[PDB]
Amino acid sequence: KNIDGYFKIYSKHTSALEPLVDLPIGINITRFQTLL
Amino acid sequence: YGFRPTYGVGHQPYRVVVLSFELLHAPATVCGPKSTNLVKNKCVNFNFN
């Protein structure tokens, strides 16, 4: 999640998800891509 | 220049440091410094962040 002031990341390993990081990096992320 | 310890008062090396401030559309993670003790069982005023 990223709303105009932060980049939030939620995770949970086996239910609800807890916040993990709150980077204040403000950028204009538009696309998503992962690497194997 | 060739500085020597036998010069006068105006011909000596001086180290000058300049600090510039910047404020743009970005979160401010650099602030300045003030914490007191804790009291209980009394009607007082508190401030927790």
Neighbouring residues of A10: CB distance < 8 A, sequence distance ≥ 6: A1, A17, A18, A19, A20
Query: In the PDB record, what is the listed experimental method?
Result: cryo-EM
After what residue numbers is chain B broken, C–N > 2.5 angstroms? 33
Contact A23, A7 (CB under 8 A): yes
The sign of the CA dihedral A19, B29, A4, B47 is positive
Q: What is the resolution of this structure in A?
A: 2.7
Q: Is A7 helix (H, G, I), strand (E, B) or coil?
A: strand
Residue B5 DSSP label: T
Neighbouring C-beta atoms of residue B5, cutoff 10 Å: 5
CB contact (8 A) between residue B29 and residue A24: yes
Is any Cβ of chain B less than 8 angstroms from the Cβ of A22?
no
**Under an 8 Å CB criterion, which residues of B touch A?**
25-27, 29
